[PDB]
Amino acid sequence: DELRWVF
Amino acid sequence: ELRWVF
Amino acid sequence: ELRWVF
Amino acid sequence: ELRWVF
Amino acid sequence: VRDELRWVF
Amino acid sequence: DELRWVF
Amino acid sequence: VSYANAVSRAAPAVANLYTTKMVSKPSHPLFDDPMFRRFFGDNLPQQKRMESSLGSAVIMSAEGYLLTNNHVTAGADQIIVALRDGRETIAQLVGSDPETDLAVLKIDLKNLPAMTLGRSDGIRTGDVCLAIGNPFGVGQTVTMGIISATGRNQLGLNTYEDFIQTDAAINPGNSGGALVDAAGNLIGINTAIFSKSGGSQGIGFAIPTKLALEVMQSIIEHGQVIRGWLGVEVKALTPELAESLGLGETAGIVVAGVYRDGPAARGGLLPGDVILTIDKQEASDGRRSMNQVARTRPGQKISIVVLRNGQKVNLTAEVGLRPPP
Amino acid sequence: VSYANAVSRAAPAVANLYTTKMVSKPSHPLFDDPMFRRFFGDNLPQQKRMESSLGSAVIMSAEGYLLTNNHVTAGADQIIVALRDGRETIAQLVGSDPETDLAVLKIDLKNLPAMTLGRSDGIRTGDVCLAIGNPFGVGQTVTMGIISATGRNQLGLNTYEDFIQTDAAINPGNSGGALVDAAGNLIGINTAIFSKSGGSQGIGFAIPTKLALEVMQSIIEHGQVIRGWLGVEVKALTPELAESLGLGETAGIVVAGVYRDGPAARGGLLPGDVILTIDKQEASDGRRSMNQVARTRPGQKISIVVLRNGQKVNLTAEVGLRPPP
Amino acid sequence: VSYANAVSRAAPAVANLYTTKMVSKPSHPLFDDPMFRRFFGDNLPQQKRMESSLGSAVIMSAEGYLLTNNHVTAGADQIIVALRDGRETIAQLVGSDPETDLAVLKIDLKNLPAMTLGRSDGIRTGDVCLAIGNPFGVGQTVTMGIISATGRNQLGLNTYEDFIQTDAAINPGNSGGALVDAAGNLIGINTAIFSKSGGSQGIGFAIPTKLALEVMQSIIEHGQVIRGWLGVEVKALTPELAESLGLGETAGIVVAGVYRDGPAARGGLLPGDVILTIDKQEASDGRRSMNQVARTRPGQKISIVVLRNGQKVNLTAEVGLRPPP
Amino acid sequence: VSYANAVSRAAPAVANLYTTKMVSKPSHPLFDDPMFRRFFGDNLPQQKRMESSLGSAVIMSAEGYLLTNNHVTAGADQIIVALRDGRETIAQLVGSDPETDLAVLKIDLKNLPAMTLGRSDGIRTGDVCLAIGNPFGVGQTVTMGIISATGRNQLGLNTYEDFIQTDAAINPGNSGGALVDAAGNLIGINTAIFSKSGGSQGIGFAIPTKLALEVMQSIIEHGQVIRGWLGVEVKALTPELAESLGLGETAGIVVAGVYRDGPAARGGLLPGDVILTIDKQEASDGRRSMNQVARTRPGQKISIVVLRNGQKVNLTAEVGLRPPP
Amino acid sequence: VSYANAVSRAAPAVANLYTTKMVSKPSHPLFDDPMFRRFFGDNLPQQKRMESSLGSAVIMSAEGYLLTNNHVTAGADQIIVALRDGRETIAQLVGSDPETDLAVLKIDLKNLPAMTLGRSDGIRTGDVCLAIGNPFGVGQTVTMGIISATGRNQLGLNTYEDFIQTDAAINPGNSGGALVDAAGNLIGINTAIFSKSGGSQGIGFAIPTKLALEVMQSIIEHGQVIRGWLGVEVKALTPELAESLGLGETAGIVVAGVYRDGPAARGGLLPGDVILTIDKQEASDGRRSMNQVARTRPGQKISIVVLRNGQKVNLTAEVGLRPPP
Amino acid sequence: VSYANAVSRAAPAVANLYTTKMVSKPSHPLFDDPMFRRFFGDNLPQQKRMESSLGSAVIMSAEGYLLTNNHVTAGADQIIVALRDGRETIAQLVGSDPETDLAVLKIDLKNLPAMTLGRSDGIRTGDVCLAIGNPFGVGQTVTMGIISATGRNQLGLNTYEDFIQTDAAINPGNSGGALVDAAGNLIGINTAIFSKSGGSQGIGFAIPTKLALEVMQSIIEHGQVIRGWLGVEVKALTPELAESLGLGETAGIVVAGVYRDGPAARGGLLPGDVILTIDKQEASDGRRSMNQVARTRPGQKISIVVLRNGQKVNLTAEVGLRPPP
């Protein structure tokens, strides 16, 4: 359930 | 095989 | 490309 | 087991 | 991986 | 069998 | 054409179910262990919860009663109900029915949308249906197909089977979700499918609403579906089955076993006895007879008419409670 | 919305085909053997006859004529026909055509439901269609889809292909089954699918009615669909090799081979010859010419014109019967 | 009853993209080769051409602009576009968008049919949709299905995802094909499927027309999609770590990492910072913030408000030009 | 050290057996065939005869007699013996005994080097041995290992077995190969291996020469081994069962069934009765007794003492010819 | 050569091991079940126990003490020892060392063959060796090979490892079996093999006699092995890393962790410390020290010299008892 | 008996070959990345050395000359040679011969033990041989066997083949290893194995020293092996094709192809020409001629006698330099 976003 | 258990 | 027979 | 045939 | 890093006592 | 030799 | 109105009417009552197992996180060489102190540690945690989504459930009441396949909820540690509007409540299992693959869940929530029921008897082959569910964890998905067939017994999945067959794609995670009619009325619960690959190949099966309801009403009332028992093992009389048994052209049920100390054993049923009549009903077809006994109330004295060695015997038995599988 | 009316129009005329294969029984250490006497004896015969489901069939006539795939019928000695109402009879195979994967069954039953025909020619892609068959021996099933395209020849499945492509779920057990339009009219016979898993993936194929009727009636009258033959093996024409007296495909067929002692062979045709016309007609396509030759009657002498070494030649040949594969 | 009308208005605007290459002809012991001289020559040609399909493109405008998936085009040296009316032409690539799996082709042809668009936002789940694509190289095929869902994100197929979920049978070779509404108006481009067998199982995903148009205009104009960069790795703050004044996720995403010499990294952003606002925007969701940063201009000065060590910190940073994946 | 002298004595007498079945010629597009004449014709035959290697054979006698595995030869129409010196000849089946997995081959060549027979009885576990075979089509191969055990039975490979076991690598192509001692004398015929992978794992098995040789002479005079028969299916006497005035192998083999119309049937032997004596011998073990019956000449009346219902019964049976499997 | 004599001394002391688990007898449709009364009875045989082999064991005492692998005996309730002479006895498990993969069994039989020990330290690579065991439950087999290597540590199989490597085929069922010298003395107990097939590929490992006998004596004295504890995790000194006072590589051990509440933990050893001395002994190799700690008696207080941040500290600690895996 | 003296003689001269892939530490969440920043950097080691072992090498000279397989050394950057005594050295590749699968490495160290050599021609099938090498990364491991065969030509792995077939377990990690005699004199380089499992099956192949030495000396002097070229493709005279006045093995080589602008082509060779003599030697077998031409030094003007359409024809060619694969 632990996801990441790169911006 | 037609079988029933009741 | 292909062949037909008759 | 029971495999002897004579 | 040759740097095994594991022995215990 | 039969094969080929290349030289 | 559109089914969006039916989708609007029906989708809010189709919730998604899941279970949580606390689990060991992948370890690290430079990080503190429960037994070892190393270079670094974690701020507040030592284990990690994993969501393990089970399948779909259907809301049947604003009281909070939910229908699902028994297999979706079997051996579940914790059942969380995720609503379409984002709400989450902890469900209480009320009862399960392994014979019909059905389980009932109870939820304490205000403002629950309920599923407007429809008659499964009124459906026909060639009717349009929509299957609502949660295939592969993707999210609420709605699928469309026709009713491929009705009343499918001989599938060999359940003790009692009355299956609708569907053309609408059903996939793993779609179990427990609704099968609806073109107006948005519940006609079934998605239950099982036939596939070489594990993905929908156009052969899905759902439990019709009339059968689902009887078991739901019974589970709420007692917490067990109560069924009848005769303790009989029954085979159909085929032309070669009759010849081995010694009856030249007899047709119908023949007993091949008597459950030890069951109602037939006390009553006098014996192996090789052709059953003529169960409780004044002609026992011509085995499936009809088993269901009849199933609905016969336990503790009732019914009269079995048997054919034993070419003579009729008027046996009397006290119908019992069918034991679990 | 329902196709239930169309199912009511069509389901009665499509059958299930079964075959029985004799099998020796499973052995036990206490039971009598064919050459051994042990402590027990079953009353049944040593060979169990297993019911095996070869496919689906369509009742075409009220005289008992039936249509199915050649691949369903080929190799089975006894074919059994099961109708929707439970009537079961034994079919005698009348004729087969492996060139189109078609075969005809003669049945002798009264009160037979026939199947209303349609025009293959009148179908348009995007039209709704139903497939009726017995997928996976699950009982007769109805699948809904649309025509995906028409005229799928050059698929390499059969010698003569003018197939319907449907998106309706088609699985093993559906072969020889009816492809029907939204009114239950028969547009095709479901034969093969294109799949990664040996299950419906949405690419389905049905032989069109216009062809099956041409084949069925020819088999009923003769016992064989009799095709005209010229013993020529041809290939297509590229414009790069069309430099001399170039027509892109006009008279664009290149002879690649000659059947030994074939009708074309006697006539004087050599490989590498470019056929310009066959039997007074432009020959710019292999499939069109293959069909044109096939519809010519055996023995009609025709004139084949070929450009060889930049010279046109007028050849005369007597059409032959096409040999069996 | 029929989608024939929708196919007639949509199918002409869908093309099949091909790729070609030359591989030598079948090897024979006596055939003159590039290395050895033998008894015979297959004419004299050294290289034979093999055409292999890549998928399907959509004709967006009548000037020759085509829309297709980046996965269909990447790795193709030469692409041939073959329309439904038999015309084949060599297309050239205007650009690609790997972050959305989209790519644009340009083609020069007279009287090109163009796809009439429709609103992605105007679709509701339950609407009939159709799929045009070349699945398995069988030829152009139309698939009918409904809209399973909208807004599918978190699939992990691409960096920026807003998929339409469809019931229509999508197979390999459907990629870059049109997902169309019941009128023949475009609603999407078919990109990918969830399948346990690599074939259709009723779960298909398409890029919606709105996102597809804005990627297309942008690719056509600046040759690519330009996006904002902040260089941050972000995770949603947990409820356990939502211990602070912010109510759970309310105005919060954690700074997991900062890109080396990145716009935020020069700005003074440090890992563990909680972003309360990006460009005076709430930023309670990682995806919404990531979309906002992508739609910010490369070169805008913006104010990031961060909470580190119980105190709000206002920082100023220069939005970068997002790098290649 | 060096087993070279052993190899010199043994290697010339082991041969390789191969069979030839003409394989269909592969086709080519520009080439000819029977039905069609094309552009080119090789100066070749319609088909070519390929050669498969069945296994090894040992030259037992200078007359041309060769002994091999039955499985190596069965259902192979033509047998070719390829000698170590390169002489290759057609051989003839003299007969086979599938009960021992042996067969006899006859060749008629001059200057044949016959093998030197050793004594299988004289060998001990721990002795050095060599296997000569054509494994995997690699060529005549010599492997070195020890004798792991002697008298292997209960393997379930063959009806009558007295297996030598070797550590020496044995692979497919070694069947019919020679087991040899330190002086290069024949001690076995390699027959079967025990492999998880299908490759030698140091557990190979070979038929000892005393049994192998006896079968060979018994196939030269007559075309089969003639064995004794009572048509009984006996099981071992368990000690728990032997509470009934009996000891564990004290004259004990239990009957499980009797062959219908067999010599045992004529004599009155019954399934479930304890045999204590056969032709005055104890019959303590089934395997000892089966071998004894096989060596009893057919047509010989013998006594069988039996324990039935706590009662000794004297029975008399006339030995019959053992039937083929 | 011949090792027949070495097998005569070695083979008697090698025993087979097996377990029995009761199993429900094969049922029939007509037979009485514990749950049902059917046409016939089975003559009351409730169930049938079937023997299952676990591997081999070696006899190290005339008093019946057996040495086998812990992997062979763990989790098995009933252990039967079967000997070369055919005697069978139930064994009593004395102790287990999971650290060396060794286990001790106790038997009460008279006239037990003892295995003569060998000097494991005196073995040389290239010496001929033999493995005795029951591989694949085929009965004891003897295999011949060579010592491939000695003292194999760093195989990741057991916490304490000294391994003899052998070229002799060792298969599943050789575990707990004897590895012997050419004179028939015990050099080791065969435990594991390196394989792709699962069979022998020529690489087999045997725990040496010096360690195995040592462990066995310890178990008889205490029921388990007793060993030293520091609760220290260590890694080698990286060659670059001997920056300050690493000259001569005196400190080859770097503390990577400390057991919480361990003797070293109480002592003041902290992770990242460099150990140069343990009981005034070399700390150069990690394995040497682990072996040294293990062979130190609990309750003995020792001294550890740690290099912490360029400073030498003289620590003191009370040796613990190594806890179980 | 022991082989430990031979091992003492040959073990020092065998080495393990070490390679390194440059790999950086795999990512973990709170640790600084190459492109991103986080709370903890990975100490100061950015990446780590990853050691992948490819095989064995024999030290053929005290000047640091090494022998191994081309397959072991192909596509490597840094080869590290680890000696038996633990000294490790970087190696530089002197040359490679892929047609023999050999490579020569040069290493600079003093006190480098040189392998004593045997004569490849001396060996007999049946001789005991030892195999030294490192299979599976375990370490240097001696294996014992016998010589299965000699002169193993026609395997198909390499262009020039003379293989020693060997019994000793050769597993992956043995390539470039030493095949040693009973006294330890090197006879071969372990190269390829035939297996189904992917492990030793007892069929092992070594390049003989006589071939290996000739290749290594040519590599040290020229950086390559220099071979003759005639640019011809040859096949045996088929028995039926010796109808042209020819002995089957006499003038046995038949031209199938001539390399474009090759020495043979320039000479006037045409396919179908039957070669009777090459450089005045009988061209009886294509393998014998293949070695004769490779061995002829490039630039020699040699006569070639050929049978062309029934007429002996004298030709001349300038033997060329053999091109690479």
PDB file of N, CA and C in Angstrom, chain J residues 1 3 124-128 144 146-149 152 155 165 167 182 194 196-197 200-203 205 238 240, chain K residues 1-5 7 48-49 84 130 135-136 138-145 168-169 171 197-200:
ATOM      1  N   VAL J   1      44.590 -46.331 -12.206  1.00  0.00           N
ATOM      2  CA  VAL J   1      45.562 -47.182 -12.957  1.00  0.00           C
ATOM      3  C   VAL J   1      45.228 -47.101 -14.451  1.00  0.00           C
ATOM      4  N   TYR J   3      42.426 -49.378 -17.234  1.00  0.00           N
ATOM      5  CA  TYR J   3      41.553 -50.519 -17.550  1.00  0.00           C
ATOM      6  C   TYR J   3      41.684 -50.820 -19.038  1.00  0.00           C
ATOM      7  N   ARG J 124      31.508 -59.442  -6.365  1.00  0.00           N
ATOM      8  CA  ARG J 124      31.169 -58.949  -5.012  1.00  0.00           C
ATOM      9  C   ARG J 124      30.918 -57.451  -5.054  1.00  0.00           C
ATOM     10  N   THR J 125      30.075 -56.957  -4.168  1.00  0.00           N
ATOM     11  CA  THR J 125      29.835 -55.516  -4.044  1.00  0.00           C
ATOM     12  C   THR J 125      31.192 -54.924  -3.664  1.00  0.00           C
ATOM     13  N   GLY J 126      31.600 -53.858  -4.335  1.00  0.00           N
ATOM     14  CA  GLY J 126      32.922 -53.246  -4.168  1.00  0.00           C
ATOM     15  C   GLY J 126      33.895 -53.600  -5.276  1.00  0.00           C
ATOM     16  N   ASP J 127      33.544 -54.515  -6.167  1.00  0.00           N
ATOM     17  CA  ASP J 127      34.405 -54.897  -7.310  1.00  0.00           C
ATOM     18  C   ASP J 127      34.372 -53.812  -8.382  1.00  0.00           C
ATOM     19  N   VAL J 128      35.434 -53.705  -9.168  1.00  0.00           N
ATOM     20  CA  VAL J 128      35.519 -52.672 -10.234  1.00  0.00           C
ATOM     21  C   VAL J 128      34.854 -53.167 -11.517  1.00  0.00           C
ATOM     22  N   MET J 144      33.539 -46.082 -16.021  1.00  0.00           N
ATOM     23  CA  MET J 144      34.060 -46.923 -14.927  1.00  0.00           C
ATOM     24  C   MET J 144      33.358 -46.604 -13.612  1.00  0.00           C
ATOM     25  N   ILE J 146      31.753 -48.928  -9.710  1.00  0.00           N
ATOM     26  CA  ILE J 146      31.842 -50.191  -8.935  1.00  0.00           C
ATOM     27  C   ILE J 146      30.496 -50.894  -8.950  1.00  0.00           C
ATOM     28  N   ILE J 147      30.478 -52.079  -8.368  1.00  0.00           N
ATOM     29  CA  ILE J 147      29.241 -52.852  -8.161  1.00  0.00           C
ATOM     30  C   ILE J 147      28.668 -52.304  -6.873  1.00  0.00           C
ATOM     31  N   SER J 148      27.462 -51.786  -6.925  1.00  0.00           N
ATOM     32  CA  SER J 148      26.838 -51.176  -5.741  1.00  0.00           C
ATOM     33  C   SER J 148      26.130 -52.224  -4.895  1.00  0.00           C
ATOM     34  N   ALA J 149      25.494 -53.180  -5.555  1.00  0.00           N
ATOM     35  CA  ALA J 149      24.752 -54.285  -4.922  1.00  0.00           C
ATOM     36  C   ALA J 149      24.503 -55.401  -5.926  1.00  0.00           C
ATOM     37  N   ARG J 152      19.400 -57.510  -7.268  1.00  0.00           N
ATOM     38  CA  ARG J 152      18.330 -56.513  -7.107  1.00  0.00           C
ATOM     39  C   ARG J 152      17.054 -57.035  -7.732  1.00  0.00           C
ATOM     40  N   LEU J 155      12.291 -54.128  -7.895  1.00  0.00           N
ATOM     41  CA  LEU J 155      12.500 -52.893  -8.670  1.00  0.00           C
ATOM     42  C   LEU J 155      11.198 -52.587  -9.372  1.00  0.00           C
ATOM     43  N   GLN J 165      23.945 -53.830  -9.761  1.00  0.00           N
ATOM     44  CA  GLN J 165      23.828 -52.362  -9.666  1.00  0.00           C
ATOM     45  C   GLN J 165      25.213 -51.716  -9.743  1.00  0.00           C
ATOM     46  N   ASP J 167      27.702 -48.043 -10.059  1.00  0.00           N
ATOM     47  CA  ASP J 167      28.028 -46.612  -9.913  1.00  0.00           C
ATOM     48  C   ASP J 167      28.440 -46.019 -11.274  1.00  0.00           C
ATOM     49  N   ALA J 182      36.917 -56.200 -14.188  1.00  0.00           N
ATOM     50  CA  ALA J 182      38.272 -55.641 -14.254  1.00  0.00           C
ATOM     51  C   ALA J 182      39.132 -56.260 -15.356  1.00  0.00           C
ATOM     52  N   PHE J 194      18.207 -45.512 -12.571  1.00  0.00           N
ATOM     53  CA  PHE J 194      17.209 -44.774 -11.767  1.00  0.00           C
ATOM     54  C   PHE J 194      17.519 -43.299 -11.884  1.00  0.00           C
ATOM     55  N   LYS J 196      16.357 -39.140 -11.762  1.00  0.00           N
ATOM     56  CA  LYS J 196      15.474 -37.976 -11.603  1.00  0.00           C
ATOM     57  C   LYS J 196      15.476 -37.208 -12.926  1.00  0.00           C
ATOM     58  N   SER J 197      16.648 -37.040 -13.529  1.00  0.00           N
ATOM     59  CA  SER J 197      16.795 -36.232 -14.763  1.00  0.00           C
ATOM     60  C   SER J 197      16.728 -37.012 -16.073  1.00  0.00           C
ATOM     61  N   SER J 200      22.525 -40.448 -16.196  1.00  0.00           N
ATOM     62  CA  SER J 200      23.102 -41.310 -15.140  1.00  0.00           C
ATOM     63  C   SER J 200      23.385 -40.542 -13.857  1.00  0.00           C
ATOM     64  N   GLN J 201      22.923 -41.100 -12.746  1.00  0.00           N
ATOM     65  CA  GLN J 201      23.116 -40.543 -11.391  1.00  0.00           C
ATOM     66  C   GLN J 201      23.852 -41.578 -10.543  1.00  0.00           C
ATOM     67  N   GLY J 202      24.639 -42.411 -11.194  1.00  0.00           N
ATOM     68  CA  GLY J 202      25.395 -43.441 -10.486  1.00  0.00           C
ATOM     69  C   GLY J 202      24.564 -44.626 -10.049  1.00  0.00           C
ATOM     70  N   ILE J 203      23.336 -44.776 -10.530  1.00  0.00           N
ATOM     71  CA  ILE J 203      22.469 -45.918 -10.109  1.00  0.00           C
ATOM     72  C   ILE J 203      21.893 -46.621 -11.335  1.00  0.00           C
ATOM     73  N   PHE J 205      21.513 -50.411 -13.690  1.00  0.00           N
ATOM     74  CA  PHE J 205      21.198 -51.827 -13.421  1.00  0.00           C
ATOM     75  C   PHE J 205      21.467 -52.685 -14.641  1.00  0.00           C
ATOM     76  N   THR J 238       1.737 -61.153   6.015  1.00  0.00           N
ATOM     77  CA  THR J 238       2.123 -60.208   7.079  1.00  0.00           C
ATOM     78  C   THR J 238       2.071 -60.974   8.403  1.00  0.00           C
ATOM     79  N   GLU J 240       1.102 -59.950  11.404  1.00  0.00           N
ATOM     80  CA  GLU J 240      -0.169 -59.666  12.121  1.00  0.00           C
ATOM     81  C   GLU J 240      -1.263 -60.582  11.572  1.00  0.00           C
TER      82      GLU J 240
ATOM     83  N   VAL K   1      41.464 -53.304  -9.488  1.00  0.00           N
ATOM     84  CA  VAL K   1      41.318 -53.107  -8.017  1.00  0.00           C
ATOM     85  C   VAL K   1      39.942 -53.603  -7.569  1.00  0.00           C
ATOM     86  N   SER K   2      39.738 -53.697  -6.261  1.00  0.00           N
ATOM     87  CA  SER K   2      38.446 -54.124  -5.670  1.00  0.00           C
ATOM     88  C   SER K   2      38.378 -53.621  -4.241  1.00  0.00           C
ATOM     89  N   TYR K   3      37.224 -53.128  -3.848  1.00  0.00           N
ATOM     90  CA  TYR K   3      36.983 -52.591  -2.501  1.00  0.00           C
ATOM     91  C   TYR K   3      36.000 -53.500  -1.794  1.00  0.00           C
ATOM     92  N   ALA K   4      35.917 -54.742  -2.229  1.00  0.00           N
ATOM     93  CA  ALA K   4      34.965 -55.725  -1.693  1.00  0.00           C
ATOM     94  C   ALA K   4      35.162 -55.916  -0.193  1.00  0.00           C
ATOM     95  N   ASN K   5      36.400 -55.964   0.261  1.00  0.00           N
ATOM     96  CA  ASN K   5      36.786 -56.088   1.683  1.00  0.00           C
ATOM     97  C   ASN K   5      36.411 -54.856   2.482  1.00  0.00           C
ATOM     98  N   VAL K   7      33.966 -52.872   1.827  1.00  0.00           N
ATOM     99  CA  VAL K   7      32.499 -53.006   1.976  1.00  0.00           C
ATOM    100  C   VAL K   7      32.187 -54.053   3.059  1.00  0.00           C
ATOM    101  N   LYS K  48      -4.439 -49.133   6.545  1.00  0.00           N
ATOM    102  CA  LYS K  48      -3.168 -49.861   6.294  1.00  0.00           C
ATOM    103  C   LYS K  48      -1.983 -48.906   6.419  1.00  0.00           C
ATOM    104  N   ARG K  49      -1.124 -49.150   7.404  1.00  0.00           N
ATOM    105  CA  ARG K  49       0.089 -48.324   7.610  1.00  0.00           C
ATOM    106  C   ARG K  49       1.078 -48.660   6.501  1.00  0.00           C
ATOM    107  N   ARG K  84      21.497 -54.290   7.879  1.00  0.00           N
ATOM    108  CA  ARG K  84      21.976 -55.127   6.760  1.00  0.00           C
ATOM    109  C   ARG K  84      21.562 -56.577   7.019  1.00  0.00           C
ATOM    110  N   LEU K 130      34.335 -44.125  -0.420  1.00  0.00           N
ATOM    111  CA  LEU K 130      33.087 -44.811  -0.773  1.00  0.00           C
ATOM    112  C   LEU K 130      31.970 -44.300   0.111  1.00  0.00           C
ATOM    113  N   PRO K 135      19.936 -44.898  -1.280  1.00  0.00           N
ATOM    114  CA  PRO K 135      19.484 -43.832  -2.148  1.00  0.00           C
ATOM    115  C   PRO K 135      18.280 -44.292  -2.953  1.00  0.00           C
ATOM    116  N   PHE K 136      17.255 -43.458  -2.942  1.00  0.00           N
ATOM    117  CA  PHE K 136      15.963 -43.663  -3.622  1.00  0.00           C
ATOM    118  C   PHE K 136      15.251 -44.861  -3.028  1.00  0.00           C
ATOM    119  N   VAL K 138      16.352 -47.847  -2.498  1.00  0.00           N
ATOM    120  CA  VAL K 138      16.626 -49.031  -3.345  1.00  0.00           C
ATOM    121  C   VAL K 138      17.339 -50.092  -2.520  1.00  0.00           C
ATOM    122  N   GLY K 139      17.597 -49.804  -1.261  1.00  0.00           N
ATOM    123  CA  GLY K 139      18.414 -50.681  -0.409  1.00  0.00           C
ATOM    124  C   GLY K 139      19.837 -50.184  -0.363  1.00  0.00           C
ATOM    125  N   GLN K 140      20.656 -50.646   0.561  1.00  0.00           N
ATOM    126  CA  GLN K 140      22.014 -50.069   0.636  1.00  0.00           C
ATOM    127  C   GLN K 140      22.789 -50.308  -0.652  1.00  0.00           C
ATOM    128  N   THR K 141      23.378 -49.232  -1.130  1.00  0.00           N
ATOM    129  CA  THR K 141      24.209 -49.181  -2.343  1.00  0.00           C
ATOM    130  C   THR K 141      25.562 -48.639  -1.933  1.00  0.00           C
ATOM    131  N   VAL K 142      26.587 -49.130  -2.568  1.00  0.00           N
ATOM    132  CA  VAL K 142      27.942 -48.611  -2.303  1.00  0.00           C
ATOM    133  C   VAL K 142      28.397 -47.943  -3.585  1.00  0.00           C
ATOM    134  N   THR K 143      29.003 -46.785  -3.471  1.00  0.00           N
ATOM    135  CA  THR K 143      29.448 -45.944  -4.596  1.00  0.00           C
ATOM    136  C   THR K 143      30.914 -45.579  -4.390  1.00  0.00           C
ATOM    137  N   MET K 144      31.702 -45.514  -5.446  1.00  0.00           N
ATOM    138  CA  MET K 144      33.127 -45.178  -5.243  1.00  0.00           C
ATOM    139  C   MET K 144      33.458 -43.833  -5.894  1.00  0.00           C
ATOM    140  N   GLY K 145      34.289 -43.035  -5.240  1.00  0.00           N
ATOM    141  CA  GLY K 145      34.697 -41.709  -5.727  1.00  0.00           C
ATOM    142  C   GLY K 145      36.051 -41.327  -5.199  1.00  0.00           C
ATOM    143  N   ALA K 168      31.938 -39.275  -5.373  1.00  0.00           N
ATOM    144  CA  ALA K 168      31.115 -40.494  -5.312  1.00  0.00           C
ATOM    145  C   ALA K 168      29.649 -40.085  -5.384  1.00  0.00           C
ATOM    146  N   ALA K 169      28.880 -40.771  -6.214  1.00  0.00           N
ATOM    147  CA  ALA K 169      27.470 -40.431  -6.403  1.00  0.00           C
ATOM    148  C   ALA K 169      26.737 -40.621  -5.086  1.00  0.00           C
ATOM    149  N   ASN K 171      22.954 -39.672  -3.533  1.00  0.00           N
ATOM    150  CA  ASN K 171      21.591 -39.358  -3.984  1.00  0.00           C
ATOM    151  C   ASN K 171      20.691 -39.109  -2.788  1.00  0.00           C
ATOM    152  N   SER K 197      19.830 -31.472 -11.408  1.00  0.00           N
ATOM    153  CA  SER K 197      18.891 -32.604 -11.600  1.00  0.00           C
ATOM    154  C   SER K 197      18.158 -32.997 -10.319  1.00  0.00           C
ATOM    155  N   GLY K 198      18.808 -32.862  -9.175  1.00  0.00           N
ATOM    156  CA  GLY K 198      18.307 -33.382  -7.893  1.00  0.00           C
ATOM    157  C   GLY K 198      19.036 -34.672  -7.572  1.00  0.00           C
ATOM    158  N   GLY K 199      19.668 -35.256  -8.574  1.00  0.00           N
ATOM    159  CA  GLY K 199      20.504 -36.448  -8.483  1.00  0.00           C
ATOM    160  C   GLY K 199      21.947 -36.078  -8.294  1.00  0.00           C
ATOM    161  N   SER K 200      22.832 -37.028  -8.408  1.00  0.00           N
ATOM    162  CA  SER K 200      24.255 -36.703  -8.223  1.00  0.00           C
ATOM    163  C   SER K 200      24.817 -36.068  -9.496  1.00  0.00           C
TER     164      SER K 200
END
